[PDB]
Design a binder for this molecule. Structure first.
Ligand SMILES: CN1C[C@H](C(=O)N[C@]2(C)O[C@@]3(O)[C@@H]4CCCN4C(=O)[C@H](Cc4ccccc4)N3C2=O)C=C2c3cccc4[nH]cc(c34)C[C@H]21
Ligand SMILES: CCCCCCCC/C=C\CCCCCCCC(=O)OC[C@@H](O)CO
Length: 379
């Protein structure tokens, strides 16, 4: 029985048009993300390479799996033969597993960057990124390779004979990566929370000590509030969590919040020199410059407190669960309920995640956002 045989001609052609536009929108949205990393020299960093390889996996899903699926989902019958069926099922398992595992490799990279910044800076290289990507693909192909027990060769479905592999495939491909992502997001969320809580205190110490220099009575009072201000600025500079946007070291970092403390420290040192010279009135007058420099970084400070990197990783985590949790839940309860339409809906729900992810990055990451605005000639 095929439930699709009951669907009318107008609803069938509309369903083909909806599915074909999702497939096309996934291909172009991921093609944009790949080209943007490739074309922009500023984006040639291991972190953006992981975005670019996630976009490559999602592009293969849109070329090897989704077009050839639209017809099978709407008609409900396989007409391409056994050989094409073998490659289609395996490219569905391999690319979707690669898609899921790219997400935790991006999270692993963000976790190490926010949790172990000094030790990781030396290890975060494009060679490291390649080795991790190869491992993801080798693990992806290894998941789809065992159901080749088809010693027998209208219907095209993956081998459901061995319950032990069926659950290993579901765990290795989904349940293990989600538990890793929850743990990874948890540590990242808590890291950023304490990093902005420290940034808030160092910012307040900077503001209050800046008030003291103005209302100072002694030279020793001026000199002390300056060294305290000096220490808080460099502490605020380390407290500020990493941005969502990743740029290569060889790129001008103007109006950057972390740079504001560098020029500010330079000014605090210039003022302490006059204080050590004996020109305290001049050292006090240097606070008028410090006041304006601080005033120019308030907007960049208030921006840091919003933790865009963890916020957007939360939206990706959220988008990943809401897209794949129904599929892998039904995938486990199916051997042990409603019709085959809910399986077709939940497969496409997982497919949709290949489109949601590149639109989340290009709306959130300002490098990808400005690249898009350039593409459609919008200012
Ligand atoms: C989205 N993609 C879809 C794809 C799939 O369901 N393909 C078929 C061809 O479509 C069905 O859903 C259809 C729809 C209506 C009736 N159907 C079935 O009765 C069986 C159910 C089934 C699900 C899982 C395992 C065995 C059988 N279907 C199929 O075999 C397998 C996936 C998968 C399975 C196992 C590990 C995995 N890692 C990544 C993935 C993946 C990607 C992931
Ligand atoms: C159909 C696809 C719709 C998916 C919507 C994605 C979204 O929520 O992203 C917004 C954030 O990037 C905002 O910063």
């Amino acid at each position: 029985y095929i439930y699709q045989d009951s669907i009318s001609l107008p609803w069938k052609v509309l369903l083909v048009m909806l599915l074909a536009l999702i497939t096309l929108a996934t291909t172009l949205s991921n093609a944009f993300v790949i080209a943007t990393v490739y074309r922009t020299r500023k984006l040639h960093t291991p972190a953006n390479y992981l975005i670019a390889s996630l976009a490559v996996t999602d592009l293969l899903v849109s070329i090897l799996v989704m077009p050839i699926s639209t017809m099978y989902t709407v008609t409900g019958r396989w007409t391409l033969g056994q050989v094409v069926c073998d490659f289609w099922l395996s490219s569905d398992i391999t690319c979707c597993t690669a898609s899921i595992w790219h997400l935790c490799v991006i999270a692993l990279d963000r976790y190490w960057a926010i949790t172990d910044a000094v030790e990781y800076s030396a290890k975060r290289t494009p060679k490291r990124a390649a080795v991790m990507i190869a491992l993801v693909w080798v693990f992806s192909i290894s998941i789809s390779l065992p159901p080749f027990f088809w010693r027998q060769a209208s219907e095209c479905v993956v081998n459901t004979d061995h319950i032990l592999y069926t659950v290993y495939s579901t765990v290795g491909a989904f349940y293990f990566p989600t538990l890793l992502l929850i743990a990874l997001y948890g540590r990242i969320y808590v890291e950023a929370r304490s990093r902005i809580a420290d940034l808030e205190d160092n910012w307040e110490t900077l503001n209050d000590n800046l008030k003291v220099i103005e209302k100072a009575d002694n030279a020793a009072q001026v000199k002390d509030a300056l060294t305290k201000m000096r220490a808080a600025a460099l502490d605020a500079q380390k407290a500020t969590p990493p941005k969502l946007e990743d740029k290569s070291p060889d790129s001008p970092e103007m109006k950057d919040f972390r740079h504001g403390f560098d020029i500010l420290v330079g000014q605090i040192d210039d003022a302490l020199k006059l204080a050590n010279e004996g020109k305290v009135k001049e050292a006090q007058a240097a606070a008028e410059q410090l006041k304006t420099t601080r005033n120019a970084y308030i907007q960049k400070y208030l921006a840091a407190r919003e933790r865009k990197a963890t916020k957007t990783l939360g939206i990706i985590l959220g988008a990943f669960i809401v897209c794949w949790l129904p599929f892998f839940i039904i995938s486990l309860v199916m051997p042990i309920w409603f019709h085959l339409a809910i399986f077709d809906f939940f497969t496409w729900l997982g497919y949709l995640n290949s489109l949601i992810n590149p639109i989340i990055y290009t709306m959130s990451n300002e490098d990808f956002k400005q690249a898009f605005h350039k593409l459609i000639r919008f200012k």
